[PDB]
Structure 1
């Protein structure tokens, strides 16, 4: 517990950019795109106001548009007098992917028409399309093969406080070891994480901070309308914060909270507000109505585990169950606890052989061990119960491909 992420003070003008969303849509062969930027303002609404959105590739300005406020009519009462949508055409855009993280810079200027900049906001933009078609998850029209890992935010001396050095150290090692994707198990990450994945190039599953694993049954709260408000905020606020990062390719509704009607309501909310990314969620059997991707945890390659209600079928068998057509990407597989990873090659042979098996996220990146000091003051790696904590789950916190100090296992 604690104030474990940054604290900052931000000055905004009274008339200000209160939100902005960037979208990139393409023609059939990705040789042409339209960047659309919806900008909202708060404060003093007057006809002299304008928004200019400009797009840059390095020091070159590739496109630019300026418009006054006032969006299209949307209903019988008119439109949003406090919003404007700019549409910029971009020819032959450089596309973003984890393989080549090409980025542009969009600068959003709020200004008077006669030239006074009130304030400017901005973001890195990655031109890419994410869509599931005919049972395949495609990025820029090609089927991805997810070489992923789940990564908690953990430092053996600082706990849950993340620092830039550590995050960079982690991304370098991930890429050096042929990973191309990371799942934010199980909550939104420190904001710099997304910037780093956008820039170095990693596909990201951004996940709402909702996990109620200890309830019995697991959906007791998620199926209860009284908890819809608290859950809604964890999903909606994450989307509002991270929707313009190109690294985020899939939204997740949280983890191990069964399948409740509140997940269905929230799945639909995100599909309405952000049609650019698929939404996934493993709870309730990994292939419920609240997921666009079959995303089991620890389903085996050939072996079925037919538990009642929530069986974990062989992944090859799961894809062809009667009526199923979605792609399957394990949200967790190959639990790397201790001397583990036995059978890892079996998963990769399957992924390469079956088109709709598009990979998965290993559990997990780094052991959650903490540093303790002995009588002589020498450091040593501690696990559950080592701090007097009880009940505890002992070494179950160490499931990493790397030790807490980032030395590889």
Structure 2
């Protein structure tokens, strides 16, 4: 049935049985634990030792592997990329796709990773409530089994996939089986210039929720003219059986002091002729003289959301960090808290020389301290959503973030072949909508980006307008198709020069001073990539900074880029050395073009 359908070769199927996207949940059962961000007993990690077997194609996987472990399987650490353990070669390629271009088909020789885990679930987890599994990231596509029964299917490597496991678990020993494919139709939208690797490369978790639960919540802030009064507006949705005694409380804390609070029953205001949302509620909280969030002073509040009965009993609690800040474009300038920003930015890939594309807290913290120590205030997630912990750290230390959808089709001819085709609009919309649903509560995220190097297509206009309408609190940018199309709020060129024009057919790169003054143009200009730092480089950097400071609508840009993407290899004596494209037998490749870092 599974190898009969071939869901990985069909751009119309991007998932089967996958749950709705939402902000990170821990499902505390105690308001104090939620407030102070202590670990939740209801959120269990499955990171550790799994069993793994490599196969050259999905038709080579034996049927028995769904029932029980293979003899010829190894023990591996999860999260990991399987190419960092020597099962096949990592591939470094820039523009050219690492497979024959024949969308939506992939090769029949599609390397396959089979992972499996035996784990114990407590009795109390099965008696009541809902148990879900969460894959924070799997590259590129995967099918999931539990206890031999098929659960679901996922695509997009860079965002979480959640499945309901309640009807599949049993008390005692359970077994998961994950089959992961290197190539899928999703691969055509992921042609970023980076190592092409695969596996379960971000965390795996079990979460237990009650049957009546918070299913989503968003936080918005609104200010008066001089930022001395704010209204915090929280929207909460519940799932499960609606009852008259259910209440929601939202409280806002600064350290140990409660600052604001609101309670209400379910049932919103009338939306249209048929009524309102019975399963939703909106709280408005007033805050006098709020401390504002910026990269210079990252003041944060804590918001706790409680679902309780009218007689006080707590069902479930969720929480997030809240920063009060307003971003808007007014009269051609990007303003934060009423003042014009100057972006000291850098592009940053998730890369480690030993672990490949697996991030940890320690490496993330090291990068943020070095960035701030070198006078950076902003980071661009080139070119996909990051690990969820990254945003929390940027909220706490103070960096502005540009969050980017996982879409790049650089190697198509022409570049907009898929982004102008309506048959791909379903696959592109999942990449953009799920990103906004996960990250919209982080104060550090200040701009959304529709992806990178995909030409300009009608699908980009559609998705630009989707974001402006669900989230008006942040500008949208997109560089493709000449950096100033109707799908961008900011003119955002890549590698335009200060004084010299580069007059390419259809997609010219004007000098940045000339671009500002073209007939009709009123937007601000922020370079999404400039000053390419490959080897011994950054000549002429002072010339950009002279222009940023002289011209009000030149508001800075993001350097390309933070860290060299080299990998480690060993010689005969066991001494380590830095390796780039081609050094793994990967062919064709782009040699040393993967090292462009400041560090």
Give me the TM-score of the superposition, normalised by structure 1. 0.98
SS across alignment from 2:252: strand
- Aligned-pair distance for 1:306? 1.0
Q: Distance in 2 between matches of 1:171 and 1:57?
A: 24
- Larger-Rg structure: 2
1:275 to 463, 472, 475: 472
Q: Deviations over 1:338-390 (max 9, x none)?
A: 00001111111100000100000000000000000111111000000010011
Runs of 5+ in structure 1 lacking a partner?
A: 403-409
- Aligned-pair distance for 1:114? 1.1
Q: Deviations over 1:159-200 (max 9, x none)?
A: 000010000000000000000000000000000000000000
SS across alignment from 1:10: strand
Q: Deviations over 1:135-174 (max 9, x none)?
A: 0000000000000000000000000000100000000000
SS across alignment from 2:423: helix
- Aligned-pair distance for 1:274? 0.3
Q: Distance in 2 between matches of 1:69 and 1:303?
A: 60
SS across alignment from 1:300: coil
Q: Distance in 2 between matches of 1:304 and 1:73?
A: 55
SS across alignment from 1:9: strand
Q: Distance in 2 between matches of 1:17 and 1:346?
A: 52
- Aligned-pair distance for 1:86? 0.6
Q: Distance in 2 between matches of 1:395 and 1:17?
A: 49
SS across alignment from 1:148: strand
- Aligned-pair distance for 1:226? 0.5
Q: Distance in 2 between matches of 1:268 and 1:24?
A: 21
Q: Deviations over 1:292-342 (max 9, x none)?
A: 000011001111111111111101111111000000000000100000001
Q: Deviations over 1:57-102 (max 9, x none)?
A: 0001000001111111101110110111110000111000000000
Partner of 1:118: 315
Q: Distance in 2 between matches of 1:179 and 1:367?
A: 18
Q: Distance in 2 between matches of 1:47 and 1:310?
A: 59
SS across alignment from 1:11: strand
Q: Distance in 2 between matches of 1:268 and 1:251?
A: 12
Equivalent pairs, count: 402
- Aligned-pair distance for 1:280? 0.2
SS across alignment from 2:426: helix
- Aligned-pair distance for 1:45? 0.9
SS across alignment from 1:345: helix
Q: Deviations over 1:243-290 (max 9, x none)?
A: 000000000000001111000000000000000000000000000000
2:522 to 321, 325, 332: 325
Q: Distance in 1 between matches of 2:582 and 2:433?
A: 36
Q: Deviations over 1:12-48 (max 9, x none)?
A: 1111111100001101000110000001111111111
Structure 1 segments of 4 or more deviating over 2 A?
none
- Aligned-pair distance for 1:116? 1.0
- Aligned-pair distance for 1:130? 0.3
Q: Distance in 2 between matches of 1:309 and 1:145?
A: 30
SS across alignment from 2:316: strand
Q: Distance in 2 between matches of 1:47 and 1:225?
A: 45
Aligned-pair Cα RMSD in Å: 0.5
SS across alignment from 1:107: strand
- Aligned-pair distance for 1:113? 1.5
Partner of 1:15: 212
Partner of 1:388: 585
Partner of 2:371: 174
SS across alignment from 1:47: coil
Partner of 2:505: 308
Partner of 1:48: 245
SS across alignment from 1:377: coil
- Aligned-pair distance for 1:115? 0.6
Q: Distance in 1 between matches of 2:389 and 2:483?
A: 30
- Aligned-pair distance for 1:118? 0.7
Q: Deviations over 1:208-250 (max 9, x none)?
A: 0000000011011001110001000000000000000000000
Runs of 5+ in structure 2 lacking a partner?
A: 1-197
Q: Distance in 2 between matches of 1:343 and 1:41?
A: 55
Partner of 2:492: 295
Q: Distance in 2 between matches of 1:15 and 1:263?
A: 38
